[PDB]
RNA sequence: AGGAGGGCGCGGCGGCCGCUGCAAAACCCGGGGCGCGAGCCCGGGCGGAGCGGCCGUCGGUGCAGAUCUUGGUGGUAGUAG
RNA sequence: UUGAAACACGGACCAAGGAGUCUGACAUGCGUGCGAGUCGACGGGUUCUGAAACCUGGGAUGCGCAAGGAAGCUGACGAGC
RNA sequence: ACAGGCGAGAGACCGAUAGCGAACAAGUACCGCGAGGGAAAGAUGAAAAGGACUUUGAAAAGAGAGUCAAAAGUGCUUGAAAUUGCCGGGAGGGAAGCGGAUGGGGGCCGGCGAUGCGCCCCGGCCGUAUGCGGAACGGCUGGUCCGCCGCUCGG
């Protein structure tokens, strides 16, 4: 038979984010990368890293 | 059996924490559960609760309501507002003014520094006024938005000036048969 | 950055942390990390949450602890000492580097416990368990 | 997202949140606007007065850049004044039409400083209250 | 990683074009290494195999042995190789196929090709 | 070691809520469901009927998930794992996943006597 | 009837942590347990190559019914004939 | 359905499949950014993993910042209890 | 602009009742006077090494045997349920099944349940102080460790 509700190709694949709101989210995803605690938290090993 | 509604229990709710995920504000909130607990000060308790406060009531306060409510009481009076402190073109004099808020537009912070005053966070309150001691709180205008413009009686009802949900304006657009004695009636 | 704020960022989620049983009141949570006495996710014990931290590990029983100045630096953030004197002369100096000096008193029973478990634990691994402990 | 919708709860439930009596149908009371006047007259004059009916001139062929006219207040006219042609200030002399604007209204206060104003259009208490201030007005096109 | 737009990293292209391949490209397909003595004396690392190629099979049940090409199977992508057999139920004698990626080639037969095709294949190995 | 749990295990029910007429029905499965039925004898808790789980069944706070060896139980998967359990020996106890060989086992196993960390299932394999 | 909250389970994607030819998935079992429950964990067997858990996010995501669809199988019945 | 064990309908059994979804326009609520501004959505530049990403075009593109009137046309002179 | 044609590339798509009707001699087999309608059907094994030979039987087949890591034995990877046969167990006066509670019988389990802990004759290590090496805490004093000495004696 058919599905239900067939999938379309006009569903909405890409999203907007406001240009500020991603420029925010980059500078505080910069600021954890200098933070060494939350560079161990995602599992990188950087134990003797001087 | 015993007669009861509910069985007693409180059906009314509120807010016992914020909506949101931000660490800022829950470390905030940390440290005013803090302050009440051990202050006993009614000022604190007022600020834990708009803490959790979501952001339609949390209006947003302009400089000229701030300079306003801030008169003469400007030396040895901070100013507290749970909320944004926006900028405003439409006046000149800009006393120096002691202010503590959630956020400031970079107009506003420029604004008060430039005339001598001070922008604090409410960490930095707590070290100033732990139990909220010469402060001025303060809140934006809640009713102040489109939304409640539309609040209230229905538009079709005697003494009602409550806005319709239209999709245009004109002449073409609800205006007709209910809005003028020559069409039918005027409600 | 401070350790209150790096705890909220840390506790949901982490390399270290192990969670079990889901979400339910069935949920088991525990940590993986080195400098973590009890192995459990909490603020006084993390790892990762803390300027402060004491390390009970064996190698002779390596005791760790970090360094407040030396964060930015990982590779001198951690000074280690190696024991291999008899329990109580090692019980002194864990008692001696973490509590008399003020450095995480609060730690003190935690490092002497996993000190107790980890000294114990060597003295199996050279002479075999001869009985076991159900009394 | 289909993760958090309410029919995602409602899985053994028979009706869906729709009733065993009032079930949910196809189009119960009509399509669209259907019945606005019939079975939903009261939905329309209780929350859409005006609705129906014939109110004012037809405009043939109305174009909208005929009724362009941007309007400033003068609350707001000494913002467009910079700080150091401030300073130097005789008034400085603001030609609004540089900022997109075509006519000038008065509401709110202006300081009480001399400004020259230039516009194409003003009204006359925006015109009072320029002058009041020690200021003038100059027509332009 | 691929740089080429032309190149085409899917799967099922990748093993469509394997199997569906024409007895020309099976050739190139069928390649086995020299052994450590040709590939020295030659300076070329694998060649395709031909039959009256002397082999050793370095991996399998059969690894050790030895023989000469008797067939190229390309059909099957195996090759047979010589007294490489089994003996089936009935007691007759079969021959066993080995994938020519698992032998070494000892020997080579050399008309007038392969030593044109050798040539070319050192020059670039070479420089 | 010597399990810490003093309290006595107490359970409001050994005995498992089938869902309702599963008995009559090969394909019908015995893992609970609500009845919704508007004339349902077991949604509507006449006497004699299935009985329903409810939020009063629930078992005491300080005793629940602990195990008849009164351990609460923690599932490993290599030795790292079993690690974790040195400091909580006396309430925790060591489960090997399923699927770990008999090569690691052996390990775990090992590992777990020096650390006096009891398995449940350390005989298995 | 209806609303809401918190959880359980299915399949992907971005991450993290693992398992497995010293036997993965699936399936079977008067095996043992945990959870009020949805479910989960372990044991024994079969099988012979892949699989899991946690955080985030997404979805063709949970069946007993619909004279529901397709396939398979009963009693009727060694009967009518 | 007022009322079902009903002499009211559907259901012999089992497995697999099987029903509030996608899109547009509004609305309330909530969350995030900025804030008298906001949006970079169509284009252009660039991009050596990339149909990502990154930069850039608005002194007037859209919603806001001002109504009322059919229209011609006018347009908030700054509160007390 | 481009659901056609020829030729390329990719995917948070489907995975054999799904995805095109068609993964396969699929617009095929087959149905209709005709216009038209329209399926089901993928998987041994690494390699056929596809089961020689003896014996019973009219044969089909069986019983031995052989190949293989495995019979995985040519609709052959795995192989659920409904339903059926046999073996063993239990019950039964016009249904049975079901809830609660015990008992009788069975099947399981040993983290199902302990054998250690303080005092004493045998085995076996060092303070205090030192020289030296590294690296700490607090904000200039004091701290720990290790290897070596030379006095020391309690463990
Ligand atoms: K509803
Ligand atoms: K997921
Ligand atoms: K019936
Ligand atoms: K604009
Ligand atoms: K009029
Ligand atoms: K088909
Ligand atoms: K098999
Ligand atoms: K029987
Ligand atoms: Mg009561
Ligand atoms: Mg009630
Ligand atoms: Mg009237
Ligand atoms: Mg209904
Ligand atoms: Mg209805
Ligand atoms: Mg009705
Ligand atoms: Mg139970
Ligand atoms: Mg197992
Ligand atoms: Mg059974
Ligand atoms: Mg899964
Ligand atoms: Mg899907
Ligand atoms: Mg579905
Ligand atoms: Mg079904
Ligand atoms: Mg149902
Ligand atoms: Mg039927
Ligand atoms: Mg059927
Ligand atoms: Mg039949
Ligand atoms: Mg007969
Ligand atoms: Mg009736
Ligand atoms: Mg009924
Ligand atoms: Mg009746
Ligand atoms: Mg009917
Ligand atoms: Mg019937
Ligand atoms: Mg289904
Ligand atoms: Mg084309
Ligand atoms: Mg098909
Ligand atoms: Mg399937
Ligand atoms: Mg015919
Ligand atoms: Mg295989
Ligand atoms: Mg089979
Ligand atoms: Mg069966």
Redesign the pocket.
């Known amino acids: ?8 190709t ?5 999203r ?11 500078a505080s995803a910069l600021a954890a990368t200098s933070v060494p605690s939350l560079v161990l938290a ?4 950087i134990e003797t890293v001087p | 059996g015993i007669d009861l509604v509910a069985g007693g229990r409180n059906k009314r709710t509120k ?1 016992v924490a ?5 660490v800022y ?1 829950k470390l905030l909130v940390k440290l005013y559960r803090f302050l009440v607990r051990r202050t006993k000060s009614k000022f604190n308790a007022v600020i834990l609760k708009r803490l ?6 949390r ?2 306060l ?1 400089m000229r309501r701030l300079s306003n409510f801030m008169k003469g009481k400007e030396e040895k009076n901070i100013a507290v507002v749970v ?7 439409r006046i000149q004099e800009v006393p120096a003014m002691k202010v503590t808020a959630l ?7 420029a604004r008060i520094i430039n005339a001598g005053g001070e922008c604090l966070t409410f960490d930095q309150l707590a070290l100033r006024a732990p139990t909220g001691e010469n402060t001025i709180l303060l809140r934006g205008p809640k009713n102040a ?4 413009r ?2 209230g009686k229905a538009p079709g009802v005697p003494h009602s000036h409550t806005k319709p ?1 239209v ?1 245009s ?3 073409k657009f609800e ?1 007709a048969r209910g ?2 004695n020559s069409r039918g009636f005027k409600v | 950055v401070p350790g209150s704020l790096v705890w909220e960022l840390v506790k ?16 088991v949570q525990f940590s ?1 990390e080195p400098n973590n006495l009890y192995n459990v996710h909490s603020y006084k014990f993390s790892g990762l949450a803390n300027s ?1 931290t004491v390390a009970v590990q064996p190698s002779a029983v390596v ?1 760790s ?6 964060q930015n630096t990982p590779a ?1 953030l ?9 329990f ?3 019980a ?2 864990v008692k ?2 973490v509590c ?4 995480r008193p609060d730690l003190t029973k935690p490092a002497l416990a996993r000190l107790s478990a980890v000294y114990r634990s060597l003295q199996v691994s050279k002479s075999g368990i ?6 | ?24 149908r196809k189009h119960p009371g009509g399509r669209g606007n259907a019945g606005g006047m019939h079975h939903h007259r009261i939905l329309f004059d209780k929350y859409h007065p005006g609705y129906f009916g014939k ?3 037809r ?1 043939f062929h109305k174009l ?1 850049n ?2 362009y ?8 006219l000494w ?1 467009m004044v910079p700080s150091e042609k401030a300073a130097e200030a005789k008034a400085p002399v603001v030609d609004v ?14 300081p009480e400083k001399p400004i020259v104003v230039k516009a194409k ?9 320029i002058k ?2 020690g200021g003038a007005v100059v027509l332009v096109a | ?3 080429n ?6 799967r ?2 990748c093993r469509k ?1 394997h199997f569906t391949a024409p007895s020309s490209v099976r050739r190139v397909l069928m390649s086995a290494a020299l052994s450590s003595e040709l590939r020295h004396k030659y300076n070329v690392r694998s060649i395709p195999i031909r039959k009256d190629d002397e082999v050793q099979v370095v991996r ?2 059969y690894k050790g042995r030895e023989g000469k090409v008797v067939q190229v199977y390309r059909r ?1 992508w ?1 090759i047979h190789v010589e007294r490489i057999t ?7 004698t ?1 021959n ?2 080995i994938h020519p990626s698992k032998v070494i080639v000892t020997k080579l037969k050399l008309d007038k090709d392969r030593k044109a095709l050798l040539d070319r294949k050192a020059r670039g190995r070479a420089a | ?3 810490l749990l003093t309290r006595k ?1 107490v ?31 077991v949604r509507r808790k006449f ?14 706070k300080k ?11 923690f ?1 490993v ?5 079993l690690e974790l359990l040195m400091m909580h ?1 006396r309430t925790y ?1 060591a ?12 390990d775990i196993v090992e590992r777990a006597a020096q650390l ?10």
Not at chain 1, 10 to 14: E, P
Not at chain 2, 52 to 57: A, D, I, V, Y
Not at chain 6, 63 to 73: D, G
């Open positions: 038979g058919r599905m239900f509700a067939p999938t379309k006009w569903r909405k694949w890409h907007r984010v406001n240009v500020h709101l991603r420029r925010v989210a980059v995602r599992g990188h090993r | 807010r914020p909506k949101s995920d931000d504000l959790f406060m979501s952001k339609t009531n209006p947003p302009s909320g944004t402190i926006t900028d405003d073109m956020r400031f537009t970079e107009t506003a912070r938005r489109e939304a409640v539309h609040f949900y999709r304006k004109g002449r205006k809005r003028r | 949901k989620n982490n390399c270290f942390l192990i969670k079990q049983f889901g979400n339910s009141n069935a949920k993986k402060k005791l602890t970090t360094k407040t100045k030396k001198k951690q000074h280690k000492t190696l024991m291999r004197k008899e109580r002369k090692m002194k100096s001696n580097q008399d000096n003020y450095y001869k009985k076991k402990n159900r009394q | 997202t289909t993760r958090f919708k309410k029919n995602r709860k409602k899985r053994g439930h028979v009706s869906a949140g729709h009733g065993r009596v009032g079930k949910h109110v004012g001139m405009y909208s005929r009724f006219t941007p309007t400033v207040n003068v609350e707001r913002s039409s540089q900022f997109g604007y075509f006519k000038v209204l008065g509401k709110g206060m202006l259009l003003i009204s006359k208490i925006a015109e009072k209250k009041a201030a | 990683m691929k740089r737009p032309r190149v085409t990293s899917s099922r292209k074009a399998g049940t099957r195996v089994r003996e089936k139920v009935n007691g007759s079969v066993v196929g | 070691a010597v399990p295990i359970k409001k029910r050994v005995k498992h809520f089938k869902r309702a007429h599963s008995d009559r029905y090969i394909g019908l499965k015995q893992s609970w469901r609500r009845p919704k039925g508007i004339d349902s004898r006497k004699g009927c299935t009985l329903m789980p409810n939020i009063g069944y629930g078992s005491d005793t629940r998930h602990y195990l008849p060896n009164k351990f609460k139980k599932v998967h290599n030795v790292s794992e020996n106890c489960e090997i996943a399923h699927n770990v060989s008999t090569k690691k086992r052996k006096d960390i009891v398995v449940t299932n350390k005989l298995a394999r």
